[model samples]
Target: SMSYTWTGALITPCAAEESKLPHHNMVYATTSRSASLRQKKVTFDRLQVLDDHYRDVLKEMKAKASTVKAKLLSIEEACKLTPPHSAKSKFGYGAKDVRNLSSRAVNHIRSVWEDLLEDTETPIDTTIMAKSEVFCVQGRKPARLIVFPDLGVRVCEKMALYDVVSTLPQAVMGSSYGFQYSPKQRVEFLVNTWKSKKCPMGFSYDTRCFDSTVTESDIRVEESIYQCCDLAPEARQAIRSLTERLYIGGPLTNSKGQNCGYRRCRASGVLTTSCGNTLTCYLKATAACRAAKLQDCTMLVNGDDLVVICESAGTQEDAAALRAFTEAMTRYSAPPGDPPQPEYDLELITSCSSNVSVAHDASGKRVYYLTRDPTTPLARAAWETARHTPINSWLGNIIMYAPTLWARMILMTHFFSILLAQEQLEKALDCQIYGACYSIEPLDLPQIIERLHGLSAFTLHSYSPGEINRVASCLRKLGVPPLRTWRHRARSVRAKLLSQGGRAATCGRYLFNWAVRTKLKLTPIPAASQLDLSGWFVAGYSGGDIYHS
Candidate 1:
């Protein structure tokens, strides 16, 4: 719970003296929670005290602010300022000029306050404590240094300057906005910072000088010191004499093709440079120390000013030996090259048919479709093409070119599939579709469904066994539910047809047979000719008048 102090002037509006209200008075100190430790979630408890006082102050300021605003407007009205000649009017004075003048001072003051707040400072002691806590206690020492490399900033201040570039027309729409580390030099700079007193951490290797020839086998030797430190002959000599030296190597290639240049290691082995047949070794070992292990290689501590290299290798039996070496050297090393980009989980889009139509929106943007059957060759081909296609077009217009857009689209689309499915269902069920004679509207569906439900419910209980079976047949055919209601509807419809006093049995039987065969895929009963029963039985019961009204 450390505290910090900041000094700044506060300006308050004075209604009684509106003309001189825009002035600053004295320096102020505000005590805030130190950022050295983890920031707690903002809660009502935290805000209670500040909210009470701030609200009161804001209310007081608002009253005076309104008066000051009115005074400024009055001044503008009296001046009749027409601004630049461009805004001059044939009548009296242009109102735009007065308005601009009235608000300029206030806007400028607001911006100034915003800058002050953003630039507020904390105590030096807190920063040191924070650095120590993050590096030592967290088992993430390198995260405290090697800031630039870890942040993927290759060129100094490149990411920072992007804000300015992003406003430019070409830059705004270009790849400049997706800046990462460039030049690949920051890794080395970090290694150097660690060797020097500039970084409190220890290390003696400068990885920047590493050439392309370094191999993973050499880097993995566990004893080879990267030779970049030798580039700065004097600095290297001074560090060697003052501190314990440990193994440093840089820019070495890894099995995954990732450059070991940024990877750092802290170990007990002596610093050795390979020669024709011998190794020049420097040894300073300790006892009773923890073995070193590699953590995150991507993060560099302190804005990449310091480079930390942790060994992916675990501690050896001689833990004390490694500690003594790290303490004495105050440095770490790596072989040079780009760290391997991690393998990420990717999404794939597949289609069922190549002939599937690609739809467009009002804005003429094309969208891909994923079909249910994905095993066919044509479907596979269509999916492959779409997958490879860059998602930079306006409805398949292909106007914009982005290499990563396709992958990004796939990833994002899959990630939000559930939400997208819900939205699609809503659109399909709620939106109206135009027809040849009349438009179909969701508002009409409820009334039609209600009328149908009532008609079916009224005759459901009087259905014949055959009618009930027919209804069940329909339900099973269509894979629909609510079978009992369907049976009643069928019976009621049949009864009404018979009440007409006509010989409906023949037509009814035919209709039922046709429906069962076509809709429900049922086997039809044999005709009289195909049956072995006596003609009397067939002529009476199986006759066309069996269902007559």
Candidate 2:
């Protein structure tokens, strides 16, 4: 079983700061010799300070909400008066409410996203033996709802829902006291919506007004939208019916003046697992591309865009900027040759939401750009003017989400560990031993293939059971303990090998011993495997030749 531990504690500043309490208080009294004159009776006591602290705080918050609601009404009225063509609907009374809601939602999402990014990027050993190995698992799905305070408020709520639909899943509930919309109303709305192809951003039935007149004084009524969805089909229906029967719909005229019009309402939207932010999509695409190593190939982008050889795909940008960058790269530049033509392989690579790839050479390499939107026209113009110029260095702080890099580093480090472990195990097994006379050099795969083109390289031989056991025991003690043990060993070995008088030394003795004898352990070759030394062997060398070798 895995265990976790907290290794440190956090402390807050001790400086004086205003109290977080909601209200203030004072007390006054008359304490004199009057007690002896009146009836020689006196009482001494501390006032019992029982205050509605929670309710007071809630009252203040509600006061703020009232201001917001008033603002919403004002903005909605303004929109109602504007002409339709000039984008008047964007800022009316309901529009204000939508803006407020949207802004709040954005902030909520940002907070969570920031927390997730911070968690990922935080430096953690992640080794099994570390205090906290840091693991995460997915949680159950959460219900979501979109609400409107009134029949008047309903339209505003729908508009707000529409704005966030592309990024989030939502449901609309009938009322706060648990009520399903009439079958006629639900059917009519759905039919009309299908005809117009207008999908609601959310779905749900009312959970307010369950037992009495839901008045403005009822804070539950105001917050009822949030309670709209906490059940499945059968349970939700039963709960809805129970709630509606408990609370009669008050005398308010519906659009149709029908008593059942505003009764228990039920509606649902298309189920989704997405939110309406571009950042989520960008991160997802990055994760996929990295897992697949998409940067290594000539990937096709959009319709006809071809990505040629690239050092990296770099980063991701918002959809709009990505589209624009792709558009700019469509114009081809000529390669260096007679009858030269545009290099058809250039494609856009986004570094981030605000930064788009700047094309330079026909070979497709070296690019940089701002990591945020250059708001001013002049700034954008300047950026475009110098877009093709190569930057010697990035100015100031280059904005980056460290979590993205941290994730990539974690994956690569794991792969590196595997390879290192394999190499170490192979060495211990002595399966590829060579004579002390042989030299070794590390090379890339392509270079190695080129060098071994026609030569017959030695093949691995079967290891004795004793040798296998020895290697297995060694690996068990080294590899199975934790990743850190192997990492420390590797670092120590590398430091030694890279130090002076380590690999390179007099007589090439250390290299020969470490590489052939210690690493491979071959002493005398078998008679069958022996090869002629011929002129390649020399007993001695000239002074200059010895130093050079």
Candidate 3:
């Protein structure tokens, strides 16, 4: 079956778009530019054959899932978690109205819920739109297509499945649920898991077009997992009916009110997409590991991305084992773009596009944290310099990769400089953690870093050679200024911020201490313990338009 059968009508943008980085080469690209290319990549005939291992893993997963009792979210509770600037419902009211609990919004939400319970087979409408993304010298990939339901259905999804999504992944996968850990926790887990092994052979598994590979049966399989939970009857029926009506397949319409096509695969924009992908990926990978004859496999999965650390048999044996793993996954319909390679070096293996790297802490102890090459983060920061993006990825990178040389020196320096110039240092900006949105105030970063990565984040120095090279080459590739330039600018930004009072002073004192010779005494933040970071890294919401509750 075709993933999507499209009409000739074009998918139009609602408003005029402008470029932020006008002269930075062709770095900024939107999905609309190569719609045909992306369409071809997303639309394919999927062949998935669930084997004995898959069934065995599914049984294990179901046992854990059965222990969870998910409750339906109250109307106000669900509304509070909707992204503030999310798209409007085709029927009427926007996210703001819903958040405000307007009569119109609440009333309409009730009707949507009622309709869901009544119409068990109607194909719900979804908007298929291209997402805008940035890149550097690496090969350009097509923009990802987001297939999402109307705003009302989305609200209903939260009411029915928020608890299930939140609780089930952690319950079923345990510590292997990647979202359950903060950045520091992730590093700790990876390091300990690697060191615990006698001969750890680690490799990341990439699902070629993960969302596209998800078929109707895959969606049903995830629903079955959900059904195992001790859910309320109403919630159970809502989940089942929603699965049959909206999730497995849907009617696709473009932004211009044209019937673009019909979908018969995963909807990348649903609330379940993140949790479902995590569960499905973990299930397939676990089964595949067993099929490969790998021993003591410990997997870290974030949605469709995966990394596995396990005991190695030998070079030849591990190579053959990975080949077997790849073959098993291929049969399950999750093929890799670049075939999996077993790496003895933990730092060489990538998961969620990050690897474990080391930096020196304040007391000169080695600190391990996750960091990727700086090309994309710096490139996006360049564009963000001039544009107001839907999400401020620079802020997220600063949060997630807080310990990295590029994140600390370059990202903090560049963005704080912009803030100082505009005199908007106190304003909060949205950044993603895992898949949830967090409105982080620039000044509160000192405390935020302390909460997530420890005070060592502020005083980290002596960056790794591999880390420096990536940033150095990225600087040249993006026509960015040298590290010395940022160092100088950081001191200025540092001084300007330090001279300011309250949280701004804390930011300068903590974030820019390395730029100066006499580093200030790093102290614990009074409010660091009070900050509600709970649900910050709890799950991945990608295209789901979810905000922290």
Give the number of the best model, judged by lDDT.
3
List runs of model 2 lying over 4 Å from the truth: 1-51, 69-156, 159-549
What is the TM-score of candidate 1?
0.16
- Backbone Cα, N, C clashes tallied per candidate: 51, 34, 1
lDDT digits (tens) for residues 303-398 of candidate 2: 011111223323342223233322222111101112111121121222112222221211233222222221121121223223321210111011
Report lDDT per candidate.
0.21, 0.22, 0.86
User: What is the TM-score of candidate 3?
Assistant: 0.97
For model 1, where is the 10-residue window of minimal lDDT? Answer: 540-549
Task: Report the candidate with higher lDDT, 1 versus 3.
Answer: 3
- After superposition, the stretches of candidate 3 with alpha carbons farther than 4 Å from their true spots are none
Report the Cα lDDT for candidate 2. Answer: 0.22
